[PDB]
Amino acid sequence: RRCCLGWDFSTQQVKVVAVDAELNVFYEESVHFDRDLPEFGTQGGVHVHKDGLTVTSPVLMWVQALDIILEKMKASGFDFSQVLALSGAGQQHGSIYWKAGAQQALTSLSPDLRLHQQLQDCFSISDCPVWMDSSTTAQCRQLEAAVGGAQALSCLTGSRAYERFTGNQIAKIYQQNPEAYSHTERISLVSSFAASLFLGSYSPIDYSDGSGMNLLQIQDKVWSQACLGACAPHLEEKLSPPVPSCSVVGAISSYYVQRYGFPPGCKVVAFTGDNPASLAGMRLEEGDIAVSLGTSDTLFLWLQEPMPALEGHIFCNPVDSQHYMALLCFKNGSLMREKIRNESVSRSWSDFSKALQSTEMGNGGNLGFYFDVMEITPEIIGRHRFNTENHKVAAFPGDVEVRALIEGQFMAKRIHAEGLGYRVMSKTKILATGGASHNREILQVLADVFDAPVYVIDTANSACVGSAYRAFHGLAGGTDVPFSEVVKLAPNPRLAATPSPGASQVYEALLPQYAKLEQRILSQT
Numbered sequence: 001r002r003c004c005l006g007w008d009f010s011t012q013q014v015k016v017v018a019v020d021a022e023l024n025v026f027y028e029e030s031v032h033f034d035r036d037l038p039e040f041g042t043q044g045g046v047h048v049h050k051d052g053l054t055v056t057s058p059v060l061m062w063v064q065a066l067d068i069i070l071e072k073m074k075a076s077g078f079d080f081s082q083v084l085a086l087s088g089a090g091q092q093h094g095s096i097y098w099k100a101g102a103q104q105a106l107t108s109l110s111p112d113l114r115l116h117q118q119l120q121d122c123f124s125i126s127d128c129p130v131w132m133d134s135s136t137t138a139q140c141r142q143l144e145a146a147v148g149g150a151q152a153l154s155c156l157t158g159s160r161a162y163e164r165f166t167g168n169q170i171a172k173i174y175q176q177n178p179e180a181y182s183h184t185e186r187i188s189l190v191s192s193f194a195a196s197l198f199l200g201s202y203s204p205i206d207y208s209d210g211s212g213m214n215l216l217q218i219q220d221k222v223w224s225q226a227c228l229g230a231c232a233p234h235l236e237e238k239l240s241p242p243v244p245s246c247s248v249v250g251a252i253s254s255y256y257v258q259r260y261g262f263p264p265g266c267k268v269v270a271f272t273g274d275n276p277a278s279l280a281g282m283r284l285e286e287g288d289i290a291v292s293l294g295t296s297d298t299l300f301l302w303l304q305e306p307m308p309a310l311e312g313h314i315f316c317n318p319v320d321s322q323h324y325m326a327l328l329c330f331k332n333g334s335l336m337r338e339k340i341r342n343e344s345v346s347r348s349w350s351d352f353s354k355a356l357q358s359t360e361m362g363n364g365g366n367l368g369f370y371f372d373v374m375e376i377t378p379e380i381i382g383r384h385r386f387n388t389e390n391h392k393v394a395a396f397p398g399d400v401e402v403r404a405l406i407e408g409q410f411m412a413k414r415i416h417a418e419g420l421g422y423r424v425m426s427k428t429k430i431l432a433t434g435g436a437s438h439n440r441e442i443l444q445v446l447a448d449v450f451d452a453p454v455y456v457i458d459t460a461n462s463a464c465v466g467s468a469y470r471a472f473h474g475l476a477g478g479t480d481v482p483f484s485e486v487v488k489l490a491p492n493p494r495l496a497a498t499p500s501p502g503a504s505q506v507y508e509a510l511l512p513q514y515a516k517l518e519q520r521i522l523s524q525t
């Protein structure tokens with residue numbers, strides 16, 4: 001039973017899965033931060049600082065969690081000698097600042113001791129900024145002004161400046177703690193930091209997670225000199241050149257061979273971001289999209305060429321370094337669906353489904369926007385309802401309200417996807433996951449709006465599983481072979497809905513009208 005390990009250095013936990021050569025998951029284990037390392041005093045794996053904007057995690061908690069999980073696997077009888085390769089994912093954007101002299105500690109690890117004891121003094125910043133941080137608005141405005149504006153920054157790096165993006169965090173550390181910055185020999189993402197621990201040497205950053213920093217020129221796949229210089233001096237030397245995501249960055253350290261029994265030939269394939277790893281785990285291809293439904297709704301897009309915008313995030317693709325992917329984030333998700341259910345259909349998901357069944361595609365021309373909190377994609381707030389004549393109305397009948405919400409949410413996803421260059425193709429598959437993917441009637445609207453089949457997939461471990469798939473891709477030939485050919489053996493998602501006859505005619509006319517009403521609301525602010 002030869003296998004690969006797929007790791008996930010997440011916000012709240014470190015998780016691992018073991019996947020066999022037939023691409024079956026047969027083992028899973030985790031270490032949860034608040035529960036298993038309570039002495040760090042985190043809540044949800046992080047520290048929200050007094051300003052209410054700075055959000056960090058202790059780097060040595062992440063190292064100690066790796067020690068705990070490897071010892072927990074060993075105590076359970078995990079056979080490490082069967083591990084051919086490993087890869088992993090890191091929560092995106094978060095950064096690690098390695099102190100001058102730290103690589104000497106990494107390359108001289110003794111198997112008699114734990115990682116935490118030996119790496120105790122290796123970090124110039126103890127509290128790492130994570131993806132939840134929103135304390136760098138001044139640095140975002142500075143970076144955009146330095147390179148010719150928000151659109152110029154987006155053309156270049158796939159995104160305008162976002163507070164959590166690494167370049168803005170590095171700029172803030174340079175500005176506020178120049179002594180710690182000047183004593184930093186290396187800056188890693190959570191992904192490349194975790195890979196470095198397994199290598200026992202510094203791992204490079206991959207193209208895909210490297211695209212979440214407002215630093216990488218996504219098309220030429222080199223660091224932007226203009227972005228680097230606007231964030232902090234001598235930054236290129238601290239990052240090192242980025243690499244294709246499907247790169248063998250080295251063999252596992254002899255530390256793991258000797259301490260846990262990994263075979264000496266065990267390969268370490270470059271780590272990537274959790275969203276890129278989930279795209280690999282979901283096995284998206286050209287023409288495909290994934291809709292992750294939850295408190296936030298997240299759209300995962302495959303893109304052959306990028307059309308970066310003031311919304312969304314375009315990254316280099318982790319399973320095909322010549323192409324791209326995108327994320328579009330929607331803040332009004334499952335809480336809006338629950339509120340409409342409670343207000344209009346007696347708090348019943350069965351009546352919610354009946355409302356969709358009892359209304360026609362296109363909802364008689366009744367259109368709605370439902371943003372109780374400020375939306376990200378695009379920046380609108382409020383509930384905005386329009387009747388068949390495009391007149392603004394105060395309310396809808398309950399069944400019309402349910403369909404307006406669901407149709408509107410999915411039409412918004414299509415319009416904003418298409419704004420980044422996405423197009424539905426004949427081969428297109430739609431992957432749906434999360435709470436609302438357990439509602440066939442919701443998935444039917446999604447199929448109708450995109451005029452493409454919808455498949456349901458469990459993604460509780462998608463970043464772990466995607467990481468193990470990427471490790472197998474490395475072993476199967478890497479860049480010499482297509483990722484999709486390696487993972488054809490993995491279990492297929494199940495078909496939940498196909499577009500109803502006439503869907504194409506309904507939404508070809510309604511999508512432009514929804515897009516114009518959205519522009520009307522944005523122009524009135």
Ligand SMILES: O=C(CO)[C@@H](O)[C@H](O)CO
Pocket residue numbers: 010011090091092093131164273274275313327
């Ligand atoms: O910040 C982002 C994406 O831009 C989150 O999805 C984190 O990657 C979660 O760990």
